[PDB]
Amino acid sequence: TQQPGCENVCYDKSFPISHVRFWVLQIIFVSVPTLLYLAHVFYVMRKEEK
Amino acid sequence: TQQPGCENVCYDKSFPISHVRFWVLQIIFVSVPTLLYLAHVFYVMRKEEK
């Protein structure tokens, strides 16, 4: 098309969120509970030491 | 503007009819009664001849 601004609005409609950024979000939210448990058990060990 | 087709629609809005063509219409409609009278009196003369 020759319509100004049509390309990026159509791209935005086609891709609400990028694939790689969505996968980054997925992997980060998957890793969050593991890091939470790691830090929690580390501080539990610190409490046990004292 | 970069909008396709805006230039000619704006030209059409600005100039509903061209100036020279409007003046041609004016002069032609002004001449019409003169030609009508000329031909009419010519045929009246032809009738008078016979």
Alpha-carbon span A26 to A19, nearest angstrom: 10
Q: Degrees (nearest 5) of the Cα angle B30, B47, B28? A: 10
Q: For residues A5 and B6, is the Cβ–Cβ distance under 8 A?
A: no
Interface test with B, best of A1, A2, A7 (most B CBs within 10 A): A2
What is the Cα–Cα distance from B35 to B39, expressed in whole angstroms?
6
Q: Are A4 and B2 in contact (CB under 8 A)?
A: yes
Amino acid at B25: L
Asked whether the beta carbons of B4 and A2 are under 8 A apart, the reply is yes
A5 and chain B in contact, CB less than 8 A: no
Check CB contact of A4 with chain B, cutoff 8 Å.
yes
Resolution of the experimental model, in Å, one decimal: 3.0
Experimental method: cryo-EM
Residues of B in contact with A7 (CB under 8 A): none
Q: How far apart are CA B9 and CA B34, in angstroms?
A: 38
Q: Answer whether B5 touches A (CB < 8 Å).
A: no
Q: What does the DSSP 8-state code read for residue A3?
A: -
